[PDB]
Amino acid sequence: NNLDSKVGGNYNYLYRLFRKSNLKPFERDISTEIYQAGSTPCNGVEGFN
Amino acid sequence: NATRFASVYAWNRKRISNCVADYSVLYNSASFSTFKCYGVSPTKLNDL
Ligand SMILES: *[C@@H]1O[C@H](CO)[C@@H](O)[C@H](O)[C@H]1NC(C)=O
């Protein structure tokens, strides 16, 4: 806490909430492509679900 | 598709029971603006 926390917040620490299928052991995923939760396609940086 | 809604000082309640709950007509119907869940992933609503 006292080595890298910042009082507004250290927003450099990121983690992944969405992934198509569970990763294999020791797998790395740098992808910043957008994730499709609903049945709709979603080309472009954003959309509904 | 209720015609009239209730007021938030006196918020109405309807109990849902003994029936099958198709969440696709909820989740994939884009007509709504927001839909958020607080103890379940919403695609898994059909699995529960
Ligand atoms: C509300 O009614 C219309 C016409 O019957 C229907 O198309 C629409 O799917 C209904 N809403 C929901 C949530 O299904």
Swiss-Prot record, chain A:
Region (Disordered) residue spans: 17-49
Region (Receptor-binding motif): 1-49
Protein origin, superkingdom: Viruses
Mutagenesis / variant outcome for changing E46Q: In strain: Kappa/B.1.617.1
Effect of F48V: In strain: Omicron/BA.4, Omicron/BA.5, Omicron/BQ.1.1
Mutation effect (A37V): Increased resistance to neutralizing antibodies
Annotated function: Attaches the virion to the cell membrane by interacting with host receptor, initiating the infection. The major receptor is host ACE2. When S2/S2' has been cleaved, binding to the receptor triggers direct fusion at the cell membrane. When S2/S2' has not been cleaved, binding to the receptor results in internalization of the virus by endocytosis using host TFRC and GRM2 and leading to fusion of the virion membrane with the host endosomal membrane. Alternatively, may use NRP1/NRP2 and integrin as entry receptors.
Name of the molecule in the record: Spike protein S1
Biological classification of the source: Viruses, Riboviria, Orthornavirae, Pisuviricota, Pisoniviricetes
Curated annotation (Swiss-Prot), chain B:
Effect of S29F: In strain: Omicron/BA.2, Omicron/BA.2.12.1, Omicron/BA.2.75, Omicron/BA.4, Omicron/BA.5, Omicron/BQ.1.1, Omicron/XBB.1.5, Omicron/EG.5.1
Impact noted for substituting S31P: In strain: Omicron/BA.1, Omicron/BA.2, Omicron/BA.2.12.1, Omicron/BA.2.75, Omicron/BA.4, Omicron/BA.5, Omicron/BQ.1.1, Omicron/XBB.1.5, Omicron/EG.5.1
Carbohydrate-modified residues: N1
Effect of R4T: In strain: Omicron/BQ.1.1, Omicron/XBB.1.5, Omicron/EG.5.1
Result of altering N1Q: Reduced viral infectivity
Reported function: Attaches the virion to the cell membrane by interacting with host receptor, initiating the infection. The major receptor is host ACE2. When S2/S2' has been cleaved, binding to the receptor triggers direct fusion at the cell membrane. When S2/S2' has not been cleaved, binding to the receptor results in internalization of the virus by endocytosis using host TFRC and GRM2 and leading to fusion of the virion membrane with the host endosomal membrane. Alternatively, may use NRP1/NRP2 and integrin as entry receptors.
Record's subunit section: Binds to host ACE2. RBD also interacts with the N-linked glycan on 'Asn-90' of ACE2. Cleavage of S generates a polybasic C-terminal sequence on S1 that binds to host Neuropilin-1 (NRP1) and Neuropilin-2 (NRP2) receptors. Interacts with host integrin alpha-5/beta-1 (ITGA5:ITGB1) and with ACE2 in complex with integrin alpha-5/beta-1 (ITGA5:ITGB1). May interact via cytoplasmic c-terminus with M protein. May interact (via N-terminus) with host bilirubin and biliverdin, thereby preventing antibody binding to the SARS-CoV-2 spike NTD via an allosteric mechanism.
Protein name in the entry: Spike protein S1
Lineage: Viruses, Riboviria, Orthornavirae, Pisuviricota, Pisoniviricetes
The encoding gene: S
Full-sequence portion shown in this chain: 343 to 390 of 1273
